[model samples]
Target chain A: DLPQPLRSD
Target chain B: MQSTSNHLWLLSDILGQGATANVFRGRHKKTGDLFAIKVFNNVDVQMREFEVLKKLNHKNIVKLFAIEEETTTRHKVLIMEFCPCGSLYTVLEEPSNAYGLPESEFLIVLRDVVGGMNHLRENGIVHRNIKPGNIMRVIGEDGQSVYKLTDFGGTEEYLHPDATVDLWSIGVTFYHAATGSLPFRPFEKEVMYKIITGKPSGAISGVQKAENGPIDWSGDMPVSCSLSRGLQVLLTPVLANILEADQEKCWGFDQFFAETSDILHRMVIHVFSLQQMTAHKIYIHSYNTATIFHELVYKQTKIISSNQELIYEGRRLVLEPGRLAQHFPKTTEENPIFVVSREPLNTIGLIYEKISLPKVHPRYDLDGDASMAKAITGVVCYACRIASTLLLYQELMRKGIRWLIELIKDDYNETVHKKTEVVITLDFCIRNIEKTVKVYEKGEISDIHTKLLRLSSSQGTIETSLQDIDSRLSPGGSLADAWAHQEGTHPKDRNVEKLQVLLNCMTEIYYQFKKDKAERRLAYNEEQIHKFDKQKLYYHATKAMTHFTDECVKKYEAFLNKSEEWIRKMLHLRKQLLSLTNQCFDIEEEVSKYQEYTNELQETL
Candidate 1:
């Protein structure tokens, strides 16, 4: 999977 | 002095000095191995270190070798594993690391500290004093550097005995490592009050003092900061949650570990720079390649990647996936991947360098083989009819059937054979050639049709149809029009001379229309409409072809102007040369006239 913005939760 | 554990030690250099104890670099007398011997300066500081150190055993935590007392001073000395590389604090003090540690090194620090703390919590212990100063760097036997937690035992906090106290300290420690200062403003009036009440400082100067004064944090890394944006973002929430002083609000070790693991497993931080653009810190998967990065770059800045070259360390990086790190492992803040263009930086004028399309063939004219062949066949068929009629006339004369009744009664079977055979032979040749040529045309067009789909995907129109030159020669519609005009005069006034001229004119017009119509439609989509429902496919191909051809002409015009200039200069030079020769001839003539005898003597000589 491609990396995305880090989730806050 | 240190003979308590059946071993002698030679203390050499002072490693570090703390309030309660001063650590020294010690060599075992018998083994000649180095150790950090912590000599307690105060007896009351606590002799309870052996209990925690004895039970604790982890690669990320400092190792305790032996507990010894000097017989002379009765001083307690903890002989522990020595870390040649000093604390993380000292490493950060280097001028190169003034803002913060590079993201690659920071991750190592974060992982090791997390590991050491996790071990401490699981073992029913909490290192309340977790900070960069207590994180020691050691080189392992595998020739890799490791960060180990040091100075574990310390004063208890007012908080509960749970590991939550250390979580906040761990958060503070990493925030410092990530940005080069404590999150809460430190060493100022109301500092303790600020720690409990204040949000983390978003200002750059708060992290590192600068005479430029405090600047507001714009959710971006400070211009001088070394951490990549990926690391900054990942670390932010981890710090925010862990730094919550309230136990109910503070994140537990599980969340901390998970987020840190996500960073390790999921993210890779690298900096990329496009031509003349400020460098960007990009977060991508370890498996992503320059190809993905190129696309990303295209979106952010509309510069196309078709002509771009991803350069790292003075060489092109292949745009394949899963090999970004393999090629440019040191793609750090200081050494970013450069997105250079293959095109020159300052192209002063139109430069059609290596515009590699098969040179455009004029699409206006198309193949006329089938239509022309059909027309010729029509002529031969009509000529056969005439010849057959002539044979009847010959038969009439040769048999001497003067009366119309006699001519009708006579057997004309032999003449019939010659006429029919002539027609049959011509029909066979036309059938064979027409069938073979159709297959050839279909084969060539099919190849083109499939290739058209690919071009359509990469780079789509009706008055367009009328303007097409091939419309004039279209077989069915125009032929019908030509055939409709074949009746120049009614049969009541039939004249062979007039009829012959009419047929000849109509046939000539039909073939002319056929040729012109072939030119119009064959270059584009009329056939595509009848064959495949994908008329747009051919439409798109033609549109792109037209567009490209337009550019081709534009380029040719530039070249044409260049060529015209060269020709003009060549002609000007020819004129000057001619003038120079004429001038030389006149001067020679004048000189000969002035010195006629001398000229004659020289010419004879």
Candidate 2:
């Protein structure tokens, strides 16, 4: 499964 | 944006986000090895980065493999080398690294970053953004961690920024790493002002709070600094030079590389205390002094440097901060250099009764007092000689030879006044004498004629005339009385006898008158001649006396010239000699101070 991009900032 | 050499990769957890793109951990679908996938929201950035980064290669630079597009959103993706550990900023964010990185880790970061920048400089590219966030940590082939520079962009083709721009950014980067805070406040114009003004906005190697509020900058470092004394000493100058915003004043990459590499290559000797197993690793150069080591150790342990001495091989290290090699040439890390209390070995109080102060030996065995006294005497005597010489001549002008004025005055009077007196007196004498002589001559000429006529008129016999003349001469001149011995009445004589007596008397009278006239004329001439001779003699004596007087006066004038000229030359000579002696005295005084210093040195020795 592709890792989901998260907005850490 | 699909390249021919594109690799299919699966994106995982997002690592970081940026304004243009987001970074995520990506794994190669085929190889199962991880990479950093920088997928841009927009497609245009990949075209330039793919072209630019393909040619750039260095171990310290992030390796860009290819660019591709994902199938679902058609998002442009950059396949770059994956650093497993994290960014340097993330490492600094860890609470354990709140103060600064460890020395070993800090050196690694310094070397890697500088090596990356050097490559960029050699390629004539400027990495305008060099900071902790752009530096990433990864595992190396040797399984050791390595730092690599990342995120350099855009200016690669032609826009050549100055190298110092990168120097400034890197300076800030390293300063942050060393001290664990930005050198300037992040979100204020004060930062811009401080950076532009070339003044540091941050505190020096310490954490301090602002008076008005909470701590402006704080860290878990020691009260002074996170870095050891030796490292701070080495890094501060390098950082300061690089941080200088004035491009002309900033250090070039060459200096930065040299200084950082020197710090990296330095040997770390572990310094231990007496009966202590724990040791502080002090980074130092072979050329650095033991005092530097002493200071570094003293800072960490609060040991007073004077009370303690560094010992190696059971010998006390000299306190002077000369080269450490002079004390321990073969020192090494395995050998434990000891810090021990500096106790006197013999431990005895110096116990002599008394000794007099050293006799002040004059320099070079020359007696200063005696020589100076003699010099003073010579100067005084020479001054006296000059003073007397000057006074002698000046007195001659003032008082002595003042008779010269009177003499000149007298000579002027004699020449102008007395000369006329002499002229008048001599003229009167000559005129009177001439008148008297003229009268005598004229009278004598007439008298001669009259006498001759009288003689011619007389007629008498020779004997009778002689007797009669004798009688006539005796009457006026006592003649007739002598002839008349018989004094009684005259003997009566005739005419013939009377004529004879008359004739004789006339003849005698004529002769006597002629002789008398001649004698009177000669006597008058003698008197006039004597008067004229006396006038001539007086003038001749005066003229000769004046001539001799002028000669003496001229001789004295020459003597005056001689003395004046002699004094002129001698005065200049004396002045030059005085100047030379003054210079000699000044030099001797200067050397006396030097000698005093040397004497103290001798006593110290």
Candidate 3:
């Protein structure tokens, strides 16, 4: 999914 | 359209425009390859933007093309990549958003923007308008993603040289990605205010409202749960940043650092949690089942032995001189190891000291009240001593015989008995020396004086017995009937000697007790004092143990930087040994007084 909002590269 | 900065391409356009200017894609005019050309109305904002771009370069950040002034609108048109995905908001709306853009892709985007903003912060600049529309993403032919930050329209230079404003922008951008909308209502003025103040107002129409207020819409909003968990979590951070309290700024940083660290930790924990759950099954079988089972068995054996010793000691105390046979038994050679050994010795010594006339007293064995009281005291001491001695003798006989049998079975020769005897002799000698030292110190009370004398005599008898036993062997004549006769001989001789000692010891004890008893014996007062002293000693011992344990624990904590309790255990073991020695000294004094009483009856014997 559009990685979670706080997701980082 | 041209391949140079002078021309622009339609499908592959590199330049974008504002009100006053038209920018073109720069390309090798001869090669037909492209770059971007920003035509500016003036050089001020373009120069500032160029300065910012030059200083900040990251994989996630877009590179700035050269700036040029055009003769119109007094405005600058900046050129950047034509982001195919449009903005983060567009990606959020796509049906294949989750599949097309992985969490890793979003992270990359966030990291780039944050890093770019961080760089801007370093150069004292803030993107006052840090909306999702200003964040762009480009899809490469290789299916790789590139995120770019664009549009510095209302960018402000941080006049106070703090990164709070920039950090706010980063947070807002995060909120936008998660909620699929701007962090605050998108009115231009409010947006600016939110970026500067950190808490403009939650977006009114962003997501479904629930009883708890606005429900978080981000699929991965767990990262922000710490922020929303409580009022302090949500508002304090925002307030500190907005207020720009220098003192509270550290508090805000701490909160951010803590929240971020926890979020990252949780992410790591999620993966590890699965692995750990799987490993637990094997761990239970290997450790909890097999290893711990063996450990518990061993511990139970030790606990059982300790309980037996404690029970035997308490039983002996309650019965006193009556059940001598039942007192905890030890080998004759190892009688010193028994709990009553010191008490027995003290009683024996006290009996001897009192039975002998007080240097100046002219009292005969019968008529003198002082001598009679001293003799009674001696009788009390003797009674305790005889009881202790008989117990010791029986214990030793049994233990030694057992050792002898074990030795015979273990070794086909007599070597085992000799070796065991030697060890016993050594232990006995040490105990004797300890008893003698206490006698010399006079810590032994008058109450125990008779017992102490008897124990002194017993010590001599024991030494002689050990010597005789050392010589007599399995082949010796004494061996056959020795076991049966040995006990009788000691009992007869001890009884005879105790009878003689008791006459004098008892006379003295009675004399002292009579004199004191006639003079209004302060028994209650003495008992209270004794109780207080005992309490004081108990407290002292407890404090000592506490301090020792604390020190050992502290040392263990500091040692090796890792192992926690092993060193503490080792330290405690050493201290316990020392305490045991102290207890032995006190017991010896008590035993001496008991021995003295038994000796005083010698005049009658």
Candidate 4:
């Protein structure tokens, strides 16, 4: 998976 | 990760703390990504943070990272860009002041707040706490100050959800930037009340003393002047919205839209003020033009009323006086012809005077006299009409009574005076006979014939009065009738006829008296004598058209009013006739019944 954006669980 | 990932780090920790979070600076684990991380408590590491972070996407707002649960105390973290210049408070209070930003930088900080607040409003969020400490300036690649907002811990679920909270935050932001003071001092109760009730203490007067020194605000950054004016215009409306006590269903949207529109208008006005101030001559010219237009309108109204009154007086003079009626051909000339000539002559003289570049001695002497004469003529005509109307009314009331009393007391004078009267009567008789002949031959109307006859009768009556001398005793039946019967009888036929005739003649006398009084009022005695002497030759010709037109107009108006009165009087007459006929019929029936009753009594006997 792509690097989760800031604050995304 | 903090100890190992950092290439080089300083103990610049614990920058700020909140109920659920504490912020600290960290050097990048690699590539030296300097950042500040907000470490949230386990309780705060929930969907709320995720939602708030997702919505706050503006460049001015701090960016967030994915939540991580290492132990039972899950920690929510926000990765924000590190600002080297630190908080505005730090910059303001710094002893060395090396990081102090200029006034222009403060203006940028306000713009950034507005942008961030706009995004917050779009996402239906309210930043309840706004202060100078929350504003930070990050040094960009080219040393430009990039203003950013920090400390979103005070973001709350708005009780009365509206964009006005954002607007209030924006206002507070501007106040802080402009005056380096918070709009309302920090008080927990006050801040909570403001968030819940949408009410905050207003910004204080911008001028204030700074640390026993005079505060300089002359070069302070502000929105444009026009924008300030528009904001003031909207103050009352915005205040009403904020102060509404009732929980109105639509108040939130109403207040939000109103404040937003006000801000937009303020911006437009500010731009206009800037543009206007830039062009000094244009502003001055516009102001001057407005003043000139107002002055012109005022003067024009005065001139118009005066001019109209002048024209009305002139028309009256040309239409009513009777002395000019005898000269038929001259009287037939339209009054407008004379009026047109006089006005044209006056305007021509005025033009001539104006045309002369230099005033010659002769011109000075002639111009004043000529203008005076023209003005006198205009005023005289107006006075004549007004005086004539007044005297005409007075004479109509009293003339018949005076004439009748004089006739009653007729006493003979000396023959010498009587002879003059006789000669005048004879001349009048001859004119009357000629007028009668003309009427009979269809050359004159019966009305004209009647007027001439009355004039001749007046002459004859004067002669008769003069012929009776003082020596003539009062015992004569004729004298007694004239003195007692004629004067006292309300319905005497002769008195009534004479009264009507005198009324017509009195109208003529009043017209002449009006002309004489007007002349006297317009000039001194000496001027009057001189004018009268000159006027004797031209009076008849000059007065003919004026008198005829006035007489025609007055008579026409009288006739129209009389006709209306007559119509009503006729209706009354018919009603009276019917009532009288009923009375007569009742009397006749009573008489017949009395006759029949008398005949029946005879039969019973």
What TM-score does chain B get in every candidate? 0.46, 0.44, 0.32, 0.31
From the highest TM-score down, the ranking of the candidates is: 1, 2, 3, 4
lDDT of 3 by residue, B1-605 (tens): 33223434443563445676554555544556555555544336757767666655665566764443333334444545445466666665432231123334644664566555555555566556476666777886689766777765422321222445434445555544543334333322433343334322322122324432433322223321212122223333442343341334433334554444333322100000010010000001211332332233223222221221111211222223223222323322232221211011111110111112123232222234343333333333333333443433443433333333333223222333443443354345445545665665683344344544454455455445445443443444333323333332234334434433444443433334444545543445543443343233324333433433343223322321221132232233334333433443454554444334333332233
lDDT of 1 by residue, B221-272 (tens): 4444456444566666666666554568676778778888877775443444
* iRMSD, all candidates: 23.5, 8.9, 42.1, 7.8
How displaced is residue B494 in candidate 1, in Å?
Answer: 99
Fnat for every candidate: 0.00, 0.00, 0.00, 0.00
TM-score of chain A of each: 0.46, 0.41, 0.22, 0.30
Q: How far out, in Å, is residue B213 in model 3?
A: 11
Using alpha carbons, what is the TM-score of model 4? Answer: 0.31
- The per-prediction tally of clashing pairs is 6, 8, 102, 15
DockQ of each: 0.01, 0.02, 0.01, 0.02
Off by over 4 Å in 3: A1-9, B1-17, B20-27, B36-52, B69-84, B97-102, B126-129, B139-144, B153-166, B181-605
lDDT of each: 0.49, 0.50, 0.38, 0.38
TM, every model? 0.45, 0.44, 0.31, 0.31
Off by over 4 Å in 2: A1-9, B1-12, B43-49, B72-75, B141-143, B154-164, B186-224, B245-247, B273-335, B341-605
For model 3, what TM-score does chain A reach?
A: 0.22
Local lDDT at B171 for model 1: 62
Candidate closest to the true structure, highest TM-score: 1
In model 3 chain B, which range of ten residues has the least summed lDDT? B272-281
Q: How would you class the docking of model 2?
A: incorrect
